[PDB]
Amino acid sequence: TVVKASYWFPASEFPVTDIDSSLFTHLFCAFADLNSQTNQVTVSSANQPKFSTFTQTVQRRNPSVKTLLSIGGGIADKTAYASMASNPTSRKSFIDSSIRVARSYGFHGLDLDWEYPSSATEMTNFGTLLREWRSAVVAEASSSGKPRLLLAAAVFYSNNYYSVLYPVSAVASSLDWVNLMAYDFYGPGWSRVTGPPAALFDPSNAGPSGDAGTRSWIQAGLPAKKAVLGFPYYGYAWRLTNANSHSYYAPTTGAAISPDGSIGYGQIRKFIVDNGATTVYNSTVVGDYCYAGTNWIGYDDNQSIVTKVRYAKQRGLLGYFSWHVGADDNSGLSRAASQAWDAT
Questions:
Q1: How far is CA 20 from the centre of its chain?
Q2: Alpha-carbon gap, residue 335 to 7, rounded angstroms
Protein backbone atom coordinates (compact mmCIF):
# COMPACT_ATOMS: atom_id res chain seq x y z
CA THR A 1 0.00 0.00 0.00
CA VAL A 2 2.73 2.50 0.98
CA VAL A 3 6.43 2.27 1.61
CA LYS A 4 8.04 4.94 3.78
CA ALA A 5 11.60 3.69 4.05
CA SER A 6 15.19 4.39 4.98
CA TYR A 7 18.50 2.54 5.10
CA TRP A 8 20.64 1.99 8.18
CA PHE A 9 24.32 0.92 8.13
CA PRO A 10 26.61 0.26 11.15
CA ALA A 11 29.53 2.49 10.06
CA SER A 12 27.20 5.54 10.29
CA GLU A 13 27.62 5.10 14.08
CA PHE A 14 23.92 6.02 14.46
CA PRO A 15 22.36 4.03 17.33
CA VAL A 16 19.51 1.75 16.11
CA THR A 17 17.50 2.96 19.12
CA ASP A 18 17.73 6.51 17.71
CA ILE A 19 15.70 5.57 14.59
CA ASP A 20 12.24 7.08 14.96
CA SER A 21 10.38 4.02 13.66
CA SER A 22 7.00 5.75 13.84
CA LEU A 23 8.09 7.71 10.72
CA PHE A 24 8.60 4.61 8.53
CA THR A 25 6.80 1.54 7.26
CA HIS A 26 10.00 -0.32 6.23
CA LEU A 27 13.60 -0.15 7.36
CA PHE A 28 16.61 -1.55 5.49
CA CYS A 29 19.61 -2.92 7.36
CA ALA A 30 22.75 -2.85 5.19
CA PHE A 31 24.77 -4.82 4.19
CA ALA A 32 24.94 -8.60 4.29
CA ASP A 33 27.76 -10.03 2.15
CA LEU A 34 28.18 -12.65 -0.55
CA ASN A 35 30.73 -15.32 0.23
CA SER A 36 32.39 -15.83 -3.14
CA GLN A 37 33.67 -19.35 -2.32
CA THR A 38 30.37 -20.80 -0.98
CA ASN A 39 27.99 -18.48 -2.89
CA GLN A 40 26.04 -17.92 0.31
CA VAL A 41 24.65 -14.79 1.87
CA THR A 42 26.55 -14.15 5.12
CA VAL A 43 26.59 -11.54 7.88
CA SER A 44 30.08 -10.53 9.01
CA SER A 45 30.93 -11.44 12.61
CA ALA A 46 31.29 -7.68 13.30
CA ASN A 47 27.76 -7.08 11.98
CA GLN A 48 26.13 -10.16 13.52
CA PRO A 49 25.01 -8.62 16.84
CA LYS A 50 23.42 -5.43 15.49
CA PHE A 51 21.90 -7.09 12.36
CA SER A 52 20.32 -9.89 14.42
CA THR A 53 18.75 -7.49 16.94
CA PHE A 54 17.91 -4.74 14.37
CA THR A 55 14.26 -5.73 13.87
CA GLN A 56 13.12 -6.21 17.48
CA THR A 57 14.99 -3.01 18.40
CA VAL A 58 13.32 -0.79 15.75
CA GLN A 59 9.94 -2.43 16.54
CA ARG A 60 10.14 -0.85 20.03
CA ARG A 61 9.25 2.58 18.60
CA ASN A 62 6.74 1.15 16.04
CA PRO A 63 5.60 -2.49 16.42
CA SER A 64 4.13 -2.33 12.89
CA VAL A 65 7.40 -1.44 11.14
CA LYS A 66 8.76 -4.09 8.76
CA THR A 67 12.46 -4.68 8.00
CA LEU A 68 14.56 -5.91 5.11
CA LEU A 69 18.15 -7.10 5.06
CA SER A 70 20.09 -5.62 2.17
CA ILE A 71 22.73 -7.65 0.36
CA GLY A 72 25.77 -6.30 -1.45
CA GLY A 73 25.88 -2.52 -1.62
CA GLY A 74 28.17 0.00 -3.30
CA ILE A 75 31.49 -1.67 -2.55
CA ALA A 76 30.46 -5.31 -3.18
CA ASP A 77 32.56 -7.47 -5.54
CA LYS A 78 30.47 -7.40 -8.72
CA THR A 79 32.43 -10.27 -10.32
CA ALA A 80 31.35 -12.50 -7.40
CA TYR A 81 27.70 -11.53 -7.93
CA ALA A 82 27.98 -12.17 -11.68
CA SER A 83 29.60 -15.61 -11.05
CA MET A 84 26.94 -16.48 -8.48
CA ALA A 85 24.06 -15.48 -10.81
CA SER A 86 25.60 -17.32 -13.82
CA ASN A 87 24.90 -20.87 -12.61
CA PRO A 88 21.71 -22.61 -11.29
CA THR A 89 23.67 -24.25 -8.42
CA SER A 90 25.30 -21.04 -7.18
CA ARG A 91 21.97 -19.16 -7.47
CA LYS A 92 20.37 -21.87 -5.32
CA SER A 93 22.97 -21.57 -2.52
CA PHE A 94 22.52 -17.77 -2.58
CA ILE A 95 18.72 -18.00 -2.52
CA ASP A 96 18.47 -20.69 0.19
CA SER A 97 20.97 -19.08 2.55
CA SER A 98 19.44 -15.60 2.07
CA ILE A 99 16.09 -17.04 3.22
CA ARG A 100 17.60 -18.87 6.25
CA VAL A 101 19.48 -15.72 7.26
CA ALA A 102 16.41 -13.46 7.02
CA ARG A 103 14.31 -15.88 9.10
CA SER A 104 16.97 -16.48 11.73
CA TYR A 105 17.78 -12.77 12.05
CA GLY A 106 14.04 -11.92 12.12
CA PHE A 107 13.80 -9.83 8.95
CA HIS A 108 10.50 -9.53 7.07
CA GLY A 109 12.31 -9.58 3.74
CA LEU A 110 15.41 -9.26 1.61
CA ASP A 111 16.82 -6.52 -0.63
CA LEU A 112 19.45 -7.20 -3.33
CA ASP A 113 21.82 -4.28 -3.92
CA TRP A 114 23.91 -5.32 -6.90
CA GLU A 115 25.11 -1.96 -8.26
CA TYR A 116 24.91 -2.68 -11.08
CA PRO A 117 24.63 -5.61 -13.51
CA SER A 118 26.60 -4.09 -16.38
CA SER A 119 25.94 -6.32 -19.39
CA ALA A 120 23.10 -8.15 -21.08
CA THR A 121 24.69 -11.38 -19.79
CA GLU A 122 24.53 -10.14 -16.17
CA MET A 123 21.03 -8.75 -16.69
CA THR A 124 19.74 -12.11 -17.98
CA ASN A 125 21.25 -13.90 -14.96
CA PHE A 126 19.91 -11.16 -12.63
CA GLY A 127 16.40 -11.68 -13.99
CA THR A 128 16.61 -15.47 -13.62
CA LEU A 129 17.94 -15.00 -10.04
CA LEU A 130 14.88 -12.90 -9.13
CA ARG A 131 12.42 -15.37 -10.64
CA GLU A 132 13.93 -18.26 -8.69
CA TRP A 133 14.07 -16.06 -5.57
CA ARG A 134 10.32 -15.33 -5.77
CA SER A 135 9.48 -19.04 -6.29
CA ALA A 136 11.68 -19.84 -3.28
CA VAL A 137 10.08 -17.35 -0.85
CA VAL A 138 6.66 -18.60 -2.04
CA ALA A 139 7.82 -22.20 -1.38
CA GLU A 140 9.22 -21.38 2.10
CA ALA A 141 6.04 -19.53 3.13
CA SER A 142 3.91 -22.55 2.20
CA SER A 143 6.41 -24.89 3.92
CA SER A 144 6.83 -22.88 7.17
CA GLY A 145 3.30 -21.41 7.38
CA LYS A 146 4.78 -17.96 8.00
CA PRO A 147 3.98 -14.75 6.05
CA ARG A 148 5.96 -14.68 2.80
CA LEU A 149 9.29 -12.82 2.87
CA LEU A 150 9.31 -9.52 0.96
CA LEU A 151 11.65 -9.12 -1.98
CA ALA A 152 13.16 -5.86 -3.19
CA ALA A 153 16.21 -4.60 -5.07
CA ALA A 154 18.07 -1.30 -5.25
CA VAL A 155 18.25 -0.38 -8.95
CA PHE A 156 19.66 2.26 -11.31
CA TYR A 157 17.60 5.46 -11.46
CA SER A 158 16.65 4.32 -15.00
CA ASN A 159 15.84 0.85 -16.43
CA ASN A 160 18.41 1.79 -19.07
CA TYR A 161 21.89 1.46 -17.61
CA TYR A 162 24.27 3.01 -20.15
CA SER A 163 22.49 1.08 -22.94
CA VAL A 164 22.15 -2.12 -20.82
CA LEU A 165 18.50 -2.84 -20.11
CA TYR A 166 17.11 -4.28 -16.89
CA PRO A 167 14.90 -7.39 -17.33
CA VAL A 168 11.74 -5.47 -16.39
CA SER A 169 9.46 -8.46 -16.81
CA ALA A 170 11.41 -10.51 -14.25
CA VAL A 171 11.58 -7.50 -11.88
CA ALA A 172 7.81 -6.81 -12.09
CA SER A 173 6.73 -10.44 -11.62
CA SER A 174 9.31 -11.34 -8.93
CA LEU A 175 9.75 -8.34 -6.61
CA ASP A 176 7.46 -6.52 -4.19
CA TRP A 177 9.20 -3.33 -5.39
CA VAL A 178 12.41 -1.70 -6.55
CA ASN A 179 14.30 1.04 -4.75
CA LEU A 180 15.06 3.69 -7.44
CA MET A 181 18.45 5.22 -6.70
CA ALA A 182 17.67 8.70 -8.05
CA TYR A 183 20.84 10.32 -6.69
CA ASP A 184 24.64 10.54 -7.15
CA PHE A 185 24.03 12.33 -10.50
CA TYR A 186 26.81 14.89 -9.94
CA GLY A 187 29.85 14.83 -7.67
CA PRO A 188 33.32 16.42 -7.82
CA GLY A 189 34.79 12.96 -8.51
CA TRP A 190 33.21 12.96 -11.98
CA SER A 191 31.89 16.50 -12.58
CA ARG A 192 34.13 19.52 -13.12
CA VAL A 193 31.12 21.77 -12.56
CA THR A 194 28.58 22.06 -9.72
CA GLY A 195 25.20 20.37 -10.18
CA PRO A 196 22.08 19.01 -8.48
CA PRO A 197 23.17 15.51 -7.33
CA ALA A 198 19.56 14.24 -7.10
CA ALA A 199 17.54 16.60 -9.32
CA LEU A 200 13.92 15.51 -9.80
CA PHE A 201 13.79 17.41 -13.14
CA ASP A 202 16.11 18.58 -15.92
CA PRO A 203 14.53 21.15 -18.33
CA SER A 204 17.68 21.25 -20.50
CA ASN A 205 17.59 17.45 -20.80
CA ALA A 206 21.40 17.55 -20.58
CA GLY A 207 21.71 15.21 -17.58
CA PRO A 208 20.03 12.64 -15.33
CA SER A 209 16.90 13.27 -13.28
CA GLY A 210 14.66 11.18 -11.01
CA ASP A 211 11.59 12.06 -13.09
CA ALA A 212 13.26 10.95 -16.37
CA GLY A 213 14.50 7.67 -14.83
CA THR A 214 11.15 6.95 -13.15
CA ARG A 215 9.24 7.61 -16.38
CA SER A 216 11.68 5.36 -18.27
CA TRP A 217 11.04 2.53 -15.80
CA ILE A 218 7.26 2.95 -16.17
CA GLN A 219 7.47 3.15 -20.00
CA ALA A 220 9.45 -0.12 -20.00
CA GLY A 221 6.70 -1.92 -18.05
CA LEU A 222 7.40 -1.45 -14.32
CA PRO A 223 4.07 -0.94 -12.57
CA ALA A 224 4.17 2.36 -10.70
CA LYS A 225 3.12 0.52 -7.53
CA LYS A 226 6.42 -1.41 -7.69
CA ALA A 227 8.58 1.73 -7.68
CA VAL A 228 9.91 3.36 -4.49
CA LEU A 229 11.62 6.67 -5.15
CA GLY A 230 14.93 7.27 -3.39
CA PHE A 231 16.49 10.53 -2.22
CA PRO A 232 19.80 11.30 -0.45
CA TYR A 233 20.24 12.61 3.11
CA TYR A 234 23.65 13.83 1.99
CA GLY A 235 25.22 16.06 -0.61
CA TYR A 236 28.40 16.82 -2.50
CA ALA A 237 30.70 19.75 -1.85
CA TRP A 238 32.83 21.42 -4.52
CA ARG A 239 35.51 24.09 -4.33
CA LEU A 240 34.43 27.03 -6.51
CA THR A 241 36.95 28.51 -8.94
CA ASN A 242 35.42 31.92 -8.28
CA ALA A 243 33.22 33.03 -5.34
CA ASN A 244 31.10 35.21 -7.67
CA SER A 245 30.00 32.17 -9.75
CA HIS A 246 27.84 29.94 -7.53
CA SER A 247 24.84 28.59 -9.47
CA TYR A 248 24.47 25.11 -10.91
CA TYR A 249 27.11 24.23 -13.55
CA ALA A 250 29.61 26.76 -12.10
CA PRO A 251 33.38 26.21 -12.63
CA THR A 252 35.17 24.30 -9.83
CA THR A 253 38.77 23.23 -9.05
CA GLY A 254 37.74 19.93 -7.44
CA ALA A 255 36.26 18.58 -4.21
CA ALA A 256 35.88 20.39 -0.92
CA ILE A 257 34.96 19.20 2.63
CA SER A 258 35.89 15.55 1.93
CA PRO A 259 37.91 13.44 -0.65
CA ASP A 260 34.92 12.70 -2.95
CA GLY A 261 32.98 15.75 -1.69
CA SER A 262 30.30 13.78 0.15
CA ILE A 263 28.80 15.22 3.34
CA GLY A 264 25.81 14.09 5.44
CA TYR A 265 22.69 16.28 5.74
CA GLY A 266 23.28 16.89 9.47
CA GLN A 267 26.77 18.24 8.70
CA ILE A 268 25.38 20.40 5.87
CA ARG A 269 22.90 22.05 8.23
CA LYS A 270 25.80 22.71 10.62
CA PHE A 271 27.89 24.15 7.78
CA ILE A 272 24.96 26.49 7.01
CA VAL A 273 24.55 27.71 10.62
CA ASP A 274 28.29 27.99 11.32
CA ASN A 275 29.00 29.91 8.13
CA GLY A 276 25.76 31.87 7.80
CA ALA A 277 25.63 30.42 4.29
CA THR A 278 23.54 31.50 1.34
CA THR A 279 20.80 28.89 0.84
CA VAL A 280 18.87 28.16 -2.34
CA TYR A 281 15.96 25.82 -3.03
CA ASN A 282 15.84 25.57 -6.82
CA SER A 283 12.33 24.55 -7.86
CA THR A 284 13.17 24.15 -11.55
CA VAL A 285 15.34 21.08 -10.80
CA VAL A 286 13.98 20.34 -7.29
CA GLY A 287 17.32 20.52 -5.48
CA ASP A 288 18.84 22.53 -2.67
CA TYR A 289 22.25 24.12 -2.47
CA CYS A 290 24.22 26.38 -0.21
CA TYR A 291 27.52 28.21 -0.40
CA ALA A 292 29.89 30.26 1.73
CA GLY A 293 33.05 31.66 0.17
CA THR A 294 34.33 29.08 -2.29
CA ASN A 295 32.57 26.12 -0.64
CA TRP A 296 29.47 24.99 -2.57
CA ILE A 297 27.26 22.04 -1.54
CA GLY A 298 24.36 20.52 -3.52
CA TYR A 299 21.97 18.36 -1.53
CA ASP A 300 18.34 17.72 -0.51
CA ASP A 301 16.69 19.86 2.14
CA ASN A 302 13.07 20.09 3.33
CA GLN A 303 11.58 21.51 0.12
CA SER A 304 13.32 18.99 -2.17
CA ILE A 305 12.12 16.09 0.01
CA VAL A 306 8.52 17.34 0.27
CA THR A 307 8.29 17.94 -3.54
CA LYS A 308 9.72 14.45 -4.29
CA VAL A 309 7.31 12.76 -1.82
CA ARG A 310 4.38 14.60 -3.46
CA TYR A 311 5.67 13.58 -6.92
CA ALA A 312 5.87 9.95 -5.75
CA LYS A 313 2.29 10.02 -4.42
CA GLN A 314 0.73 11.91 -7.33
CA ARG A 315 2.41 9.82 -10.05
CA GLY A 316 1.11 6.58 -8.43
CA LEU A 317 4.43 5.33 -7.01
CA LEU A 318 4.45 2.92 -4.06
CA GLY A 319 6.46 5.30 -1.90
CA TYR A 320 9.91 6.68 -1.07
CA PHE A 321 13.17 5.83 0.71
CA SER A 322 16.20 7.72 1.97
CA TRP A 323 19.91 6.97 2.10
CA HIS A 324 20.52 7.10 4.99
CA VAL A 325 18.71 7.32 8.34
CA GLY A 326 21.86 8.25 10.28
CA ALA A 327 22.49 11.46 8.29
CA ASP A 328 19.15 13.19 8.97
CA ASP A 329 19.00 16.10 11.44
CA ASN A 330 16.84 14.89 14.34
CA SER A 331 14.54 12.97 11.89
CA GLY A 332 13.60 16.33 10.31
CA LEU A 333 13.60 15.20 6.67
CA SER A 334 11.93 11.85 7.41
CA ARG A 335 9.30 13.57 9.54
CA ALA A 336 8.67 16.08 6.75
CA ALA A 337 8.46 13.24 4.20
CA SER A 338 5.86 11.25 6.18
CA GLN A 339 3.68 14.33 6.85
CA ALA A 340 3.97 15.41 3.20
CA TRP A 341 2.84 11.93 2.12
CA ASP A 342 -0.06 11.79 4.58
CA ALA A 343 -1.41 15.25 3.65
CA THR A 344 -1.30 14.85 -0.17
A1: 18
A2: 15
Which residue pairs from 100-105 have beta carbons closer than 8 angstroms and sit at least 24 positions apart in sequence? 101/32, 101/41, 101/42, 101/43, 101/69, 102/69, 102/149, 103/140, 103/144, 103/146, 103/149, 104/52, 105/43, 105/51, 105/52, 105/54, 105/55, 105/69
Burial class (CB in 10 A: 0-12, 13-18, 19+), 16: buried
* Coil/strand/helix, residue 242: coil
Same domain, 337 and 239: no
Q: Minimal CA–CA distance to 297: which of 265, 329, 274, 273?
A: 265
Q: Give the domain CATH number at 141.
A: 3.20.20.80
Range of the domain at 327: 1-232+300-344
If asked whether residues 254 and 286 sit together in one domain, one would say yes
Question: Rounded to whole angstroms, how far apart are CA atoms 290 and 276?
Answer: 10
- Which one of the listed residues 115, 122, 132, 140 is annotated catalytic? 115
Instruction: Mark 247-256 as b/e (b = at least 16 C-beta within 10 Å).
Output: ebbbebeebb
Say if residue 337 is in the same domain as residue 245: no
- Confirm or deny that 323 is annotated as ligand binding: yes
My answer on whether 191 and 242 are in the same domain is no
Q: Do residue 78 and residue 164 come from a single domain?
A: yes
Q: Are residue 146 and residue 257 in the same domain, yes or no?
A: no
Q: Calculate the dihedral angle through the C-alpha atoms of 227, 201, 221, 153, rounding to the nearest 10 degrees.
A: -40
Backbone angles phi, psi at 307, to 5 degrees: -60, -45
Resolution of the experimental model, in Å, one decimal: 2.0
Question: Do 180 and 270 have their domain in common?
Answer: no
DSSP 217-233: HHHTT--GGGEEEEEES
Residue 145 labeled ligand binder: no
> Which of helix, strand or coil describes residue 204?
coil
Query: Helices marked H in the chain — which ranges?
Result: 48-58, 78-86, 88-105, 120-144, 168-174, 210-219, 265-275, 302-314, 332-343
Method for this entry: X-ray
Q: Is 122 a catalytic residue?
A: no
Give the count of domains, the chain.
Answer: 2
Q: DSSP secondary-structure letter at 158?
A: S
Q: Give yes or no: residues 184 and 245 share one domain.
A: no
Omega of the bond leading into 14 within 30 degrees of 0 (cis): no
